[model samples]
Target: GTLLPRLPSEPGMTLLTIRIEKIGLKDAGQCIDPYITVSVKDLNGIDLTPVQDTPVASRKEDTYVHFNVDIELQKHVEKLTKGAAIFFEFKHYKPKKRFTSTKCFAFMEMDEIKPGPIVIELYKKPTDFKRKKLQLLTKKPLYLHLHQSLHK
Candidate 1:
Protein backbone atom coordinates (compact mmCIF):
# COMPACT_ATOMS: atom_id res chain seq x y z
CA GLY A 1 0.00 0.00 0.00
CA THR A 2 1.25 3.51 -0.83
CA LEU A 3 0.10 7.04 -1.52
CA LEU A 4 -1.39 7.58 -4.94
CA PRO A 5 -3.15 10.21 -7.06
CA ARG A 6 -6.75 10.92 -6.20
CA LEU A 7 -8.15 9.58 -9.47
CA PRO A 8 -7.29 6.19 -10.90
CA SER A 9 -5.02 5.98 -13.94
CA GLU A 10 -7.77 4.59 -16.14
CA PRO A 11 -7.65 4.83 -19.90
CA GLY A 12 -10.16 7.61 -20.21
CA MET A 13 -10.43 11.35 -20.34
CA THR A 14 -11.67 13.67 -17.63
CA LEU A 15 -13.56 16.91 -17.80
CA LEU A 16 -12.89 19.63 -15.25
CA THR A 17 -15.02 22.73 -15.06
CA ILE A 18 -14.41 25.69 -12.85
CA ARG A 19 -16.72 28.65 -12.51
CA ILE A 20 -15.61 31.90 -10.93
CA GLU A 21 -18.49 33.50 -9.10
CA LYS A 22 -17.53 36.68 -7.26
CA ILE A 23 -14.77 38.68 -5.65
CA GLY A 24 -15.03 40.52 -2.34
CA LEU A 25 -12.67 43.22 -1.18
CA LYS A 26 -11.57 43.75 2.35
CA ASP A 27 -11.65 47.56 2.22
CA ALA A 28 -13.24 48.50 -1.06
CA GLY A 29 -9.87 49.92 -2.04
CA GLN A 30 -10.45 51.47 -5.45
CA CYS A 31 -13.29 51.04 -7.89
CA ILE A 32 -10.90 49.80 -10.54
CA ASP A 33 -12.18 47.65 -13.37
CA PRO A 34 -10.84 44.22 -12.73
CA TYR A 35 -10.60 40.74 -14.30
CA ILE A 36 -9.05 37.45 -13.33
CA THR A 37 -6.63 35.20 -15.19
CA VAL A 38 -6.58 31.53 -14.25
CA SER A 39 -4.38 28.59 -15.11
CA VAL A 40 -3.99 24.97 -14.13
CA LYS A 41 -0.74 23.21 -13.35
CA ASP A 42 0.51 19.89 -12.12
CA LEU A 43 2.38 19.24 -8.91
CA ASN A 44 5.69 19.47 -10.76
CA GLY A 45 4.87 23.10 -11.64
CA ILE A 46 4.14 22.39 -15.28
CA ASP A 47 1.36 24.67 -16.48
CA LEU A 48 -1.53 23.43 -18.63
CA THR A 49 -2.13 25.25 -21.86
CA PRO A 50 -4.71 27.92 -22.66
CA VAL A 51 -5.00 30.13 -19.63
CA GLN A 52 -8.51 31.49 -19.13
CA ASP A 53 -9.90 34.94 -18.31
CA THR A 54 -13.01 35.81 -16.39
CA PRO A 55 -15.43 38.49 -17.46
CA VAL A 56 -14.44 41.96 -16.33
CA ALA A 57 -16.68 43.75 -13.93
CA SER A 58 -17.72 47.30 -14.72
CA ARG A 59 -16.97 50.01 -12.20
CA LYS A 60 -19.99 49.32 -10.07
CA GLU A 61 -18.86 48.60 -6.52
CA ASP A 62 -15.47 49.06 -5.05
CA THR A 63 -16.14 46.28 -2.57
CA TYR A 64 -17.57 43.43 -4.60
CA VAL A 65 -18.14 42.14 -8.14
CA HIS A 66 -19.41 39.00 -9.84
CA PHE A 67 -17.64 37.29 -12.74
CA ASN A 68 -19.68 34.23 -13.59
CA VAL A 69 -17.53 32.50 -16.16
CA ASP A 70 -16.85 28.81 -16.77
CA ILE A 71 -13.46 27.50 -17.78
CA GLU A 72 -13.35 23.93 -19.03
CA LEU A 73 -10.46 21.62 -19.78
CA GLN A 74 -10.34 17.97 -20.74
CA LYS A 75 -7.41 15.67 -20.27
CA HIS A 76 -6.56 12.07 -19.60
CA VAL A 77 -7.11 11.02 -16.02
CA GLU A 78 -3.47 10.14 -15.52
CA LYS A 79 -2.37 13.52 -16.81
CA LEU A 80 -3.76 15.31 -13.77
CA THR A 81 -1.70 14.22 -10.84
CA LYS A 82 -2.98 14.21 -7.30
CA GLY A 83 -1.36 17.56 -6.57
CA ALA A 84 -2.67 19.36 -9.64
CA ALA A 85 -3.80 22.88 -8.78
CA ILE A 86 -5.29 26.06 -10.16
CA PHE A 87 -3.70 29.52 -9.99
CA PHE A 88 -5.37 32.88 -10.22
CA GLU A 89 -4.20 36.42 -10.81
CA PHE A 90 -6.59 39.30 -10.40
CA LYS A 91 -5.60 42.31 -12.47
CA HIS A 92 -6.93 45.82 -12.72
CA TYR A 93 -7.89 46.58 -16.32
CA LYS A 94 -7.36 50.20 -17.16
CA PRO A 95 -8.78 51.12 -20.53
CA LYS A 96 -7.05 54.47 -20.50
CA LYS A 97 -3.63 52.96 -19.83
CA ARG A 98 -1.92 50.09 -21.61
CA PHE A 99 -0.28 48.62 -18.55
CA THR A 100 -2.16 46.40 -16.13
CA SER A 101 -1.09 45.73 -12.57
CA THR A 102 -2.08 42.57 -10.76
CA LYS A 103 -4.24 43.20 -7.74
CA CYS A 104 -4.05 39.79 -6.03
CA PHE A 105 -3.30 36.12 -6.48
CA ALA A 106 -4.63 32.72 -5.32
CA PHE A 107 -4.38 28.96 -5.88
CA MET A 108 -6.11 25.77 -4.79
CA GLU A 109 -4.64 22.29 -4.78
CA MET A 110 -6.60 19.49 -6.43
CA ASP A 111 -6.13 17.28 -3.39
CA GLU A 112 -8.18 19.77 -1.40
CA ILE A 113 -10.53 20.52 -4.26
CA LYS A 114 -14.20 20.15 -3.38
CA PRO A 115 -17.51 20.06 -5.14
CA GLY A 116 -20.16 22.80 -4.95
CA PRO A 117 -19.29 26.43 -4.22
CA ILE A 118 -16.33 27.48 -2.13
CA VAL A 119 -14.33 30.54 -1.15
CA ILE A 120 -10.65 31.04 -1.83
CA GLU A 121 -8.68 33.88 -0.28
CA LEU A 122 -6.56 36.11 -2.49
CA TYR A 123 -2.92 36.88 -1.85
CA LYS A 124 -0.34 39.47 -2.84
CA LYS A 125 1.80 37.19 -5.00
CA PRO A 126 1.58 34.01 -7.02
CA THR A 127 2.28 30.64 -5.45
CA ASP A 128 5.92 29.94 -4.84
CA PHE A 129 6.99 27.24 -7.28
CA LYS A 130 9.30 25.86 -4.64
CA ARG A 131 6.51 25.78 -2.08
CA LYS A 132 3.67 25.02 -4.52
CA LYS A 133 1.22 27.13 -2.52
CA LEU A 134 0.19 30.72 -1.78
CA GLN A 135 -0.12 32.92 1.31
CA LEU A 136 -2.64 35.56 2.27
CA LEU A 137 -1.90 39.22 1.77
CA THR A 138 -4.57 42.00 1.92
CA LYS A 139 -7.28 39.39 2.54
CA LYS A 140 -9.51 39.43 -0.53
CA PRO A 141 -11.91 36.52 -0.99
CA LEU A 142 -13.19 34.93 -4.18
CA TYR A 143 -16.05 32.48 -4.76
CA LEU A 144 -15.90 29.45 -7.07
CA HIS A 145 -18.05 26.60 -8.32
CA LEU A 146 -16.39 23.30 -9.27
CA HIS A 147 -17.36 20.26 -11.33
CA GLN A 148 -15.47 17.15 -12.44
CA SER A 149 -16.46 14.13 -14.47
CA LEU A 150 -14.98 11.18 -16.29
CA HIS A 151 -15.46 10.58 -20.00
CA LYS A 152 -15.57 7.03 -21.08
Candidate 2:
Protein backbone atom coordinates (compact mmCIF):
# COMPACT_ATOMS: atom_id res chain seq x y z
CA GLY A 1 0.00 0.00 0.00
CA THR A 2 1.55 3.34 -1.06
CA LEU A 3 0.21 5.81 1.45
CA LEU A 4 0.64 9.55 1.03
CA PRO A 5 4.02 10.51 2.44
CA ARG A 6 3.77 13.21 5.08
CA LEU A 7 6.05 16.10 5.92
CA PRO A 8 6.21 16.89 9.61
CA SER A 9 5.93 20.52 10.66
CA GLU A 10 9.20 21.02 12.43
CA PRO A 11 10.16 24.27 14.18
CA GLY A 12 11.53 27.13 12.05
CA MET A 13 10.31 25.46 8.91
CA THR A 14 8.06 27.44 6.56
CA LEU A 15 5.55 25.19 4.89
CA LEU A 16 4.49 25.86 1.32
CA THR A 17 1.62 23.90 -0.16
CA ILE A 18 1.38 23.15 -3.91
CA ARG A 19 -1.29 20.91 -5.34
CA ILE A 20 -1.26 19.59 -8.91
CA GLU A 21 -4.94 19.62 -9.83
CA LYS A 22 -5.04 17.79 -13.15
CA ILE A 23 -2.88 16.10 -15.76
CA GLY A 24 -3.63 15.63 -19.43
CA LEU A 25 -2.56 13.05 -21.98
CA LYS A 26 -3.83 14.51 -25.28
CA ASP A 27 -4.84 18.00 -24.22
CA ALA A 28 -8.17 16.40 -23.33
CA GLY A 29 -7.35 13.22 -21.38
CA GLN A 30 -5.65 12.29 -18.10
CA CYS A 31 -3.82 9.19 -16.98
CA ILE A 32 -5.05 6.62 -14.47
CA ASP A 33 -2.48 7.15 -11.69
CA PRO A 34 -0.34 10.20 -12.26
CA TYR A 35 1.96 10.62 -9.27
CA ILE A 36 4.54 13.38 -8.98
CA THR A 37 7.87 14.10 -7.33
CA VAL A 38 8.92 17.73 -7.13
CA SER A 39 12.39 19.26 -7.01
CA VAL A 40 13.34 22.82 -6.13
CA LYS A 41 16.41 24.59 -7.45
CA ASP A 42 18.10 27.94 -7.07
CA LEU A 43 17.51 30.64 -9.66
CA ASN A 44 21.06 30.19 -10.95
CA GLY A 45 20.06 26.69 -12.16
CA ILE A 46 21.85 24.83 -9.37
CA ASP A 47 21.52 23.34 -5.91
CA LEU A 48 18.26 21.46 -6.42
CA THR A 49 16.23 20.14 -3.46
CA PRO A 50 13.80 17.26 -3.79
CA VAL A 51 10.57 16.40 -1.99
CA GLN A 52 8.92 13.09 -1.23
CA ASP A 53 6.56 11.37 -3.66
CA THR A 54 2.88 12.13 -3.14
CA PRO A 55 0.06 9.63 -2.97
CA VAL A 56 -0.62 8.00 -6.31
CA ALA A 57 -3.58 9.29 -8.36
CA SER A 58 -4.36 5.59 -8.22
CA ARG A 59 -6.80 4.05 -10.75
CA LYS A 60 -8.81 7.02 -12.11
CA GLU A 61 -8.22 9.87 -9.69
CA ASP A 62 -7.92 13.39 -11.20
CA THR A 63 -6.04 15.05 -8.31
CA TYR A 64 -2.37 15.58 -7.59
CA VAL A 65 -0.60 14.12 -4.61
CA HIS A 66 1.83 16.91 -3.60
CA PHE A 67 0.65 19.08 -0.72
CA ASN A 68 3.40 20.89 1.24
CA VAL A 69 7.12 21.44 1.60
CA ASP A 70 9.45 23.06 4.14
CA ILE A 71 11.10 25.96 2.37
CA GLU A 72 11.88 29.06 4.42
CA LEU A 73 11.08 31.84 1.94
CA GLN A 74 12.74 34.67 3.80
CA LYS A 75 16.03 32.87 3.98
CA HIS A 76 15.97 31.87 0.30
CA VAL A 77 14.29 35.03 -0.97
CA GLU A 78 17.71 36.50 -1.60
CA LYS A 79 18.45 33.61 -3.96
CA LEU A 80 15.04 33.40 -5.61
CA THR A 81 14.02 35.15 -8.79
CA LYS A 82 11.21 35.40 -11.33
CA GLY A 83 12.43 32.32 -13.17
CA ALA A 84 13.07 30.39 -10.01
CA ALA A 85 10.44 27.69 -10.35
CA ILE A 86 10.18 24.20 -8.96
CA PHE A 87 10.52 21.20 -11.28
CA PHE A 88 8.11 18.26 -11.13
CA GLU A 89 8.59 14.81 -12.60
CA PHE A 90 5.25 13.06 -13.19
CA LYS A 91 5.11 9.26 -13.21
CA HIS A 92 2.81 6.27 -12.60
CA TYR A 93 2.72 2.53 -11.85
CA LYS A 94 0.51 -0.59 -12.12
CA PRO A 95 0.43 -4.37 -11.92
CA LYS A 96 1.23 -6.57 -14.95
CA LYS A 97 1.64 -3.37 -16.99
CA ARG A 98 3.65 -0.16 -16.62
CA PHE A 99 4.55 3.12 -18.37
CA THR A 100 5.94 6.57 -17.52
CA SER A 101 4.97 10.18 -17.96
CA THR A 102 6.90 13.25 -19.07
CA LYS A 103 8.72 15.89 -17.03
CA CYS A 104 6.64 18.80 -15.81
CA PHE A 105 7.56 21.84 -13.71
CA ALA A 106 5.93 24.94 -12.22
CA PHE A 107 6.58 28.25 -10.54
CA MET A 108 6.53 28.52 -6.76
CA GLU A 109 5.74 32.20 -6.59
CA MET A 110 3.68 33.79 -3.85
CA ASP A 111 1.43 35.53 -6.36
CA GLU A 112 0.77 32.22 -8.05
CA ILE A 113 -0.56 30.79 -4.80
CA LYS A 114 -4.17 31.64 -4.21
CA PRO A 115 -5.86 32.30 -0.87
CA GLY A 116 -7.52 28.92 -1.05
CA PRO A 117 -6.27 25.71 -2.68
CA ILE A 118 -2.94 25.72 -4.51
CA VAL A 119 -4.37 24.02 -7.54
CA ILE A 120 -2.30 23.38 -10.67
CA GLU A 121 -3.34 21.90 -14.01
CA LEU A 122 -0.52 20.42 -16.06
CA TYR A 123 -1.10 19.58 -19.72
CA LYS A 124 0.75 16.99 -21.74
CA LYS A 125 2.09 17.23 -25.27
CA PRO A 126 1.20 14.14 -27.28
CA THR A 127 4.31 14.35 -29.46
CA ASP A 128 6.83 14.92 -26.69
CA PHE A 129 6.70 11.33 -25.66
CA LYS A 130 10.17 9.73 -26.02
CA ARG A 131 9.07 6.13 -26.59
CA LYS A 132 8.88 6.48 -30.38
CA LYS A 133 5.22 5.51 -30.36
CA LEU A 134 4.40 8.29 -32.80
CA GLN A 135 6.89 7.44 -35.56
CA LEU A 136 9.49 9.73 -33.99
CA LEU A 137 12.06 7.09 -34.75
CA THR A 138 14.88 9.41 -35.90
CA LYS A 139 16.20 11.87 -33.36
CA LYS A 140 14.98 15.40 -33.90
CA PRO A 141 15.45 18.74 -32.16
CA LEU A 142 12.68 18.74 -29.57
CA TYR A 143 12.62 22.49 -29.16
CA LEU A 144 12.41 22.99 -32.89
CA HIS A 145 9.68 20.39 -33.22
CA LEU A 146 7.73 21.92 -30.36
CA HIS A 147 7.99 25.33 -31.99
CA GLN A 148 6.59 23.96 -35.22
CA SER A 149 3.75 22.19 -33.45
CA LEU A 150 2.52 25.48 -32.00
CA HIS A 151 1.89 26.89 -35.47
CA LYS A 152 -0.44 24.07 -36.48
Candidate 3:
Protein backbone atom coordinates (compact mmCIF):
# COMPACT_ATOMS: atom_id res chain seq x y z
CA GLY A 1 0.00 0.00 0.00
CA THR A 2 0.92 3.69 -0.25
CA LEU A 3 2.85 5.17 2.64
CA LEU A 4 2.65 8.79 3.78
CA PRO A 5 6.02 9.90 2.46
CA ARG A 6 8.51 11.47 4.90
CA LEU A 7 6.36 10.92 8.01
CA PRO A 8 7.22 8.25 10.52
CA SER A 9 5.13 5.82 12.61
CA GLU A 10 5.69 3.85 15.84
CA PRO A 11 3.12 1.60 17.29
CA GLY A 12 -0.49 1.54 16.25
CA MET A 13 -3.92 2.04 14.57
CA THR A 14 -7.64 1.26 14.77
CA LEU A 15 -10.89 0.36 13.07
CA LEU A 16 -11.97 4.00 12.92
CA THR A 17 -15.71 4.03 12.70
CA ILE A 18 -17.03 7.45 11.72
CA ARG A 19 -20.77 7.33 12.16
CA ILE A 20 -22.42 10.08 10.10
CA GLU A 21 -25.83 10.57 11.55
CA LYS A 22 -28.31 13.45 11.45
CA ILE A 23 -27.02 14.50 8.03
CA GLY A 24 -29.55 17.15 7.19
CA LEU A 25 -29.63 19.27 4.03
CA LYS A 26 -31.10 22.61 3.01
CA ASP A 27 -34.51 22.72 1.33
CA ALA A 28 -33.41 23.08 -2.28
CA GLY A 29 -36.09 22.43 -4.88
CA GLN A 30 -33.76 19.75 -6.26
CA CYS A 31 -32.56 16.74 -4.31
CA ILE A 32 -29.31 16.74 -2.33
CA ASP A 33 -27.22 13.80 -3.47
CA PRO A 34 -24.47 13.61 -0.89
CA TYR A 35 -20.87 12.48 -1.31
CA ILE A 36 -18.52 12.15 1.62
CA THR A 37 -14.72 12.07 1.40
CA VAL A 38 -11.98 11.09 3.88
CA SER A 39 -8.25 11.60 3.78
CA VAL A 40 -5.80 8.77 3.33
CA LYS A 41 -2.79 11.04 3.00
CA ASP A 42 -2.02 14.55 4.23
CA LEU A 43 0.88 17.03 4.64
CA ASN A 44 0.52 18.34 1.03
CA GLY A 45 -3.21 17.81 0.75
CA ILE A 46 -2.37 14.55 -0.94
CA ASP A 47 -4.73 11.56 -0.74
CA LEU A 48 -8.42 12.24 -0.38
CA THR A 49 -10.70 9.21 -0.64
CA PRO A 50 -14.42 8.50 -0.55
CA VAL A 51 -16.27 5.79 1.33
CA GLN A 52 -16.45 2.43 -0.40
CA ASP A 53 -20.19 2.79 -0.93
CA THR A 54 -21.23 6.42 -0.72
CA PRO A 55 -24.82 7.44 0.27
CA VAL A 56 -27.08 10.05 -1.36
CA ALA A 57 -30.49 11.66 -1.98
CA SER A 58 -30.73 14.39 0.65
CA ARG A 59 -34.07 15.58 -0.71
CA LYS A 60 -36.52 15.07 2.09
CA GLU A 61 -37.24 17.73 4.68
CA ASP A 62 -35.20 17.34 7.90
CA THR A 63 -33.10 14.45 6.69
CA TYR A 64 -30.39 12.47 8.38
CA VAL A 65 -27.97 10.79 5.97
CA HIS A 66 -26.29 8.20 8.09
CA PHE A 67 -23.24 6.21 7.06
CA ASN A 68 -19.79 5.17 8.15
CA VAL A 69 -16.11 5.87 7.34
CA ASP A 70 -14.70 2.66 8.69
CA ILE A 71 -10.93 2.92 8.66
CA GLU A 72 -10.06 -0.71 9.03
CA LEU A 73 -6.66 -1.46 10.51
CA GLN A 74 -6.54 -4.55 8.31
CA LYS A 75 -5.69 -2.15 5.52
CA HIS A 76 -2.26 -0.50 5.49
CA VAL A 77 -3.60 2.60 7.28
CA GLU A 78 -1.22 1.60 10.06
CA LYS A 79 1.77 2.83 8.05
CA LEU A 80 0.28 4.96 5.25
CA THR A 81 -0.87 7.62 7.69
CA LYS A 82 2.22 8.01 9.80
CA GLY A 83 2.22 11.58 11.08
CA ALA A 84 0.14 13.55 8.61
CA ALA A 85 -2.95 15.63 9.11
CA ILE A 86 -6.40 14.35 8.09
CA PHE A 87 -9.92 15.44 7.17
CA PHE A 88 -13.37 14.32 6.03
CA GLU A 89 -16.09 15.93 3.95
CA PHE A 90 -19.82 15.92 3.44
CA LYS A 91 -20.49 17.23 -0.07
CA HIS A 92 -23.04 16.84 -2.85
CA TYR A 93 -22.61 14.99 -6.15
CA LYS A 94 -25.40 14.48 -8.62
CA PRO A 95 -25.34 11.75 -11.21
CA LYS A 96 -23.06 12.78 -14.10
CA LYS A 97 -23.08 16.37 -12.92
CA ARG A 98 -20.53 18.65 -11.32
CA PHE A 99 -20.38 18.33 -7.55
CA THR A 100 -21.56 21.27 -5.50
CA SER A 101 -21.15 22.19 -1.86
CA THR A 102 -23.62 22.65 0.93
CA LYS A 103 -21.16 20.68 2.93
CA CYS A 104 -18.76 20.34 5.84
CA PHE A 105 -15.03 19.62 5.74
CA ALA A 106 -13.28 18.97 9.07
CA PHE A 107 -9.54 18.43 9.56
CA MET A 108 -7.22 16.91 12.17
CA GLU A 109 -3.63 15.95 12.79
CA MET A 110 -2.72 12.24 12.87
CA ASP A 111 -0.75 12.17 16.10
CA GLU A 112 -3.22 14.56 17.68
CA ILE A 113 -6.40 12.49 17.50
CA LYS A 114 -8.01 10.68 20.44
CA PRO A 115 -10.71 8.05 20.09
CA GLY A 116 -14.11 9.71 20.52
CA PRO A 117 -17.16 11.17 18.85
CA ILE A 118 -16.94 14.31 16.70
CA VAL A 119 -19.89 16.21 15.28
CA ILE A 120 -19.69 18.25 12.07
CA GLU A 121 -22.27 20.59 10.64
CA LEU A 122 -22.04 21.58 6.97
CA TYR A 123 -23.08 24.86 5.36
CA LYS A 124 -25.14 26.40 2.61
CA LYS A 125 -21.91 28.21 1.89
CA PRO A 126 -18.70 27.67 3.81
CA THR A 127 -17.29 30.52 5.82
CA ASP A 128 -14.22 32.68 5.03
CA PHE A 129 -12.25 30.09 6.96
CA LYS A 130 -11.08 27.65 4.34
CA ARG A 131 -8.75 25.78 6.72
CA LYS A 132 -9.42 25.19 10.42
CA LYS A 133 -7.94 23.30 13.34
CA LEU A 134 -9.47 20.27 15.15
CA GLN A 135 -8.62 18.32 18.29
CA LEU A 136 -10.23 15.50 20.28
CA LEU A 137 -10.66 15.11 24.02
CA THR A 138 -10.79 11.95 26.08
CA LYS A 139 -13.84 13.27 27.93
CA LYS A 140 -16.02 15.25 25.49
CA PRO A 141 -16.70 15.23 21.76
CA LEU A 142 -14.94 17.44 19.26
CA TYR A 143 -17.36 20.33 18.85
CA LEU A 144 -16.25 21.15 15.35
CA HIS A 145 -16.71 24.26 13.23
CA LEU A 146 -20.43 24.31 12.73
CA HIS A 147 -21.40 25.60 9.31
CA GLN A 148 -25.08 26.46 9.48
CA SER A 149 -26.46 24.20 6.79
CA LEU A 150 -29.27 22.19 8.44
CA HIS A 151 -29.04 19.70 11.27
CA LYS A 152 -31.71 20.39 13.76
Candidate 4:
Protein backbone atom coordinates (compact mmCIF):
# COMPACT_ATOMS: atom_id res chain seq x y z
CA GLY A 1 0.00 0.00 0.00
CA THR A 2 1.14 3.54 -0.77
CA LEU A 3 1.49 5.64 2.37
CA LEU A 4 0.81 9.34 1.94
CA PRO A 5 1.70 12.12 4.41
CA ARG A 6 -0.58 13.36 7.17
CA LEU A 7 -2.52 16.61 7.44
CA PRO A 8 -4.08 18.78 10.15
CA SER A 9 -6.26 16.59 12.37
CA GLU A 10 -8.41 19.35 13.82
CA PRO A 11 -11.21 20.88 11.83
CA GLY A 12 -10.14 24.43 10.94
CA MET A 13 -9.45 26.74 8.03
CA THR A 14 -6.25 28.29 6.70
CA LEU A 15 -5.54 30.87 4.02
CA LEU A 16 -3.46 29.80 1.03
CA THR A 17 -1.49 32.33 -0.95
CA ILE A 18 -1.10 31.88 -4.68
CA ARG A 19 0.77 34.11 -7.12
CA ILE A 20 1.30 33.72 -10.85
CA GLU A 21 3.37 35.74 -13.32
CA LYS A 22 3.72 35.66 -17.07
CA ILE A 23 7.23 34.33 -17.50
CA GLY A 24 6.92 34.07 -21.27
CA LEU A 25 4.86 35.84 -23.88
CA LYS A 26 3.92 35.35 -27.52
CA ASP A 27 4.99 38.87 -28.53
CA ALA A 28 8.41 38.12 -27.06
CA GLY A 29 8.86 35.19 -29.45
CA GLN A 30 8.50 32.58 -26.71
CA CYS A 31 5.55 30.92 -28.54
CA ILE A 32 3.63 30.67 -25.28
CA ASP A 33 0.62 32.54 -23.95
CA PRO A 34 2.04 32.27 -20.38
CA TYR A 35 -0.88 31.91 -18.01
CA ILE A 36 -1.04 30.06 -14.69
CA THR A 37 -3.73 27.94 -13.05
CA VAL A 38 -3.83 27.75 -9.24
CA SER A 39 -5.76 25.17 -7.26
CA VAL A 40 -5.93 23.78 -3.69
CA LYS A 41 -6.76 20.32 -2.39
CA ASP A 42 -7.29 18.16 0.70
CA LEU A 43 -5.01 15.52 2.26
CA ASN A 44 -6.45 12.85 0.00
CA GLY A 45 -5.39 14.88 -3.03
CA ILE A 46 -8.90 16.07 -3.71
CA ASP A 47 -9.01 19.45 -5.37
CA LEU A 48 -10.82 21.99 -3.23
CA THR A 49 -11.29 24.37 -6.10
CA PRO A 50 -11.48 27.98 -4.98
CA VAL A 51 -13.82 30.46 -6.66
CA GLN A 52 -11.67 32.80 -8.71
CA ASP A 53 -13.09 35.54 -10.90
CA THR A 54 -11.38 37.47 -13.60
CA PRO A 55 -9.17 40.22 -12.20
CA VAL A 56 -10.81 43.61 -12.13
CA ALA A 57 -9.09 46.71 -13.33
CA SER A 58 -7.81 48.88 -10.51
CA ARG A 59 -8.86 52.49 -10.08
CA LYS A 60 -5.30 53.58 -9.45
CA GLU A 61 -2.84 54.02 -12.30
CA ASP A 62 -0.09 51.92 -10.76
CA THR A 63 -2.32 48.93 -10.24
CA TYR A 64 -3.43 46.96 -13.30
CA VAL A 65 -5.78 44.37 -11.78
CA HIS A 66 -7.46 43.66 -8.44
CA PHE A 67 -8.56 40.23 -7.27
CA ASN A 68 -11.02 39.46 -4.49
CA VAL A 69 -11.21 35.81 -3.33
CA ASP A 70 -12.56 34.12 -0.21
CA ILE A 71 -11.97 30.43 0.59
CA GLU A 72 -12.73 28.14 3.57
CA LEU A 73 -10.77 24.96 4.37
CA GLN A 74 -12.68 23.39 7.27
CA LYS A 75 -14.34 20.61 5.24
CA HIS A 76 -11.20 19.99 3.22
CA VAL A 77 -8.96 19.05 6.14
CA GLU A 78 -11.60 16.84 7.73
CA LYS A 79 -11.04 14.00 5.25
CA LEU A 80 -7.37 13.34 5.86
CA THR A 81 -4.73 12.58 8.48
CA LYS A 82 -1.99 14.87 9.75
CA GLY A 83 0.93 15.92 7.51
CA ALA A 84 -0.67 15.18 4.13
CA ALA A 85 0.87 16.72 1.05
CA ILE A 86 -0.93 19.58 -0.74
CA PHE A 87 0.08 19.27 -4.35
CA PHE A 88 0.35 22.29 -6.70
CA GLU A 89 0.70 21.68 -10.40
CA PHE A 90 1.88 24.22 -13.00
CA LYS A 91 1.11 23.80 -16.69
CA HIS A 92 2.69 26.01 -19.28
CA TYR A 93 0.52 27.11 -22.19
CA LYS A 94 2.38 26.97 -25.45
CA PRO A 95 1.65 28.84 -28.68
CA LYS A 96 -1.16 27.97 -31.12
CA LYS A 97 -3.50 27.91 -28.13
CA ARG A 98 -2.09 24.56 -27.04
CA PHE A 99 -0.67 23.59 -23.65
CA THR A 100 2.87 22.37 -23.29
CA SER A 101 3.48 18.63 -23.60
CA THR A 102 5.31 18.58 -20.29
CA LYS A 103 4.57 20.60 -17.15
CA CYS A 104 7.73 21.64 -15.31
CA PHE A 105 6.79 22.46 -11.70
CA ALA A 106 7.35 22.12 -7.96
CA PHE A 107 5.31 21.65 -4.76
CA MET A 108 5.45 22.30 -0.99
CA GLU A 109 4.11 20.73 2.21
CA MET A 110 1.14 22.47 3.83
CA ASP A 111 1.62 21.29 7.44
CA GLU A 112 4.26 23.91 8.26
CA ILE A 113 2.00 26.72 6.98
CA LYS A 114 0.15 28.69 9.66
CA PRO A 115 -3.15 30.56 9.44
CA GLY A 116 -2.49 33.88 7.84
CA PRO A 117 -2.58 35.72 4.51
CA ILE A 118 -0.09 34.25 2.06
CA VAL A 119 1.29 35.49 -1.25
CA ILE A 120 2.58 33.60 -4.28
CA GLU A 121 4.45 35.68 -6.87
CA LEU A 122 5.29 34.49 -10.36
CA TYR A 123 7.97 36.17 -12.43
CA LYS A 124 8.05 36.98 -16.18
CA LYS A 125 11.54 35.76 -16.85
CA PRO A 126 11.19 32.23 -18.17
CA THR A 127 14.54 32.42 -19.92
CA ASP A 128 16.26 33.60 -16.77
CA PHE A 129 18.34 30.68 -15.56
CA LYS A 130 18.43 32.11 -12.04
CA ARG A 131 14.87 30.97 -11.38
CA LYS A 132 14.93 27.63 -9.61
CA LYS A 133 12.18 25.18 -8.72
CA LEU A 134 10.41 25.55 -5.33
CA GLN A 135 12.01 28.94 -4.86
CA LEU A 136 9.92 31.46 -2.85
CA LEU A 137 11.27 34.48 -4.74
CA THR A 138 8.32 36.78 -4.24
CA LYS A 139 8.82 40.07 -2.41
CA LYS A 140 6.59 38.87 0.45
CA PRO A 141 5.34 35.40 1.17
CA LEU A 142 1.79 36.69 1.72
CA TYR A 143 1.59 39.97 -0.17
CA LEU A 144 2.47 41.96 2.96
CA HIS A 145 3.47 44.94 0.87
CA LEU A 146 -0.12 45.48 -0.24
CA HIS A 147 -1.41 45.83 3.32
CA GLN A 148 -0.03 48.10 6.04
CA SER A 149 -2.25 47.13 8.98
CA LEU A 150 -1.98 43.35 8.44
CA HIS A 151 0.97 42.98 10.81
CA LYS A 152 -0.43 45.45 13.35
Best by TM-score: 1
Q: Cα deviation in Å at residue 15, candidate 4?
A: 3.1
For this target, which candidate reaches the highest lDDT against the unseen true structure?
1
> Any idea what lDDT model 3 has?
0.41
lDDT of 1 by residue, 1-152 (tens): 01112233345555456666667765433636577777677767677545666656544355666666665543453466777777777777555676677766667776655456666676765445334455666533433233433344
Candidate 4, 34-65: lDDT as tens digits: 22233344454555544222232122112222
Question: Candidate 1: misplaced stretches above 4 Å?
Answer: 1-12, 27-31, 58-60, 74-78, 94-98, 126-135, 139-152
Each candidate's clash count = 0, 0, 0, 11
lDDT string for model 3 (34-143, tens) is 65554544455555343233345333334345443233222334444564545555566554667566355555555544455555534333521234443322222322
What TM-score fits each model? Answer: 0.69, 0.44, 0.48, 0.35
RMSD of each: 7.6, 11.4, 9.9, 10.2
All candidates' lDDT scores? 0.58, 0.38, 0.41, 0.31
TM-score of 3: 0.48
Clashing pairs in 2: none
Error of 3 at 62 (Å): 3.1
> For candidate 4, which ten residues in a row score worst on lDDT?
143-152
**Positional deviation of residue 57's Cα in model 3 after best superposition, in angstroms:** 5.6
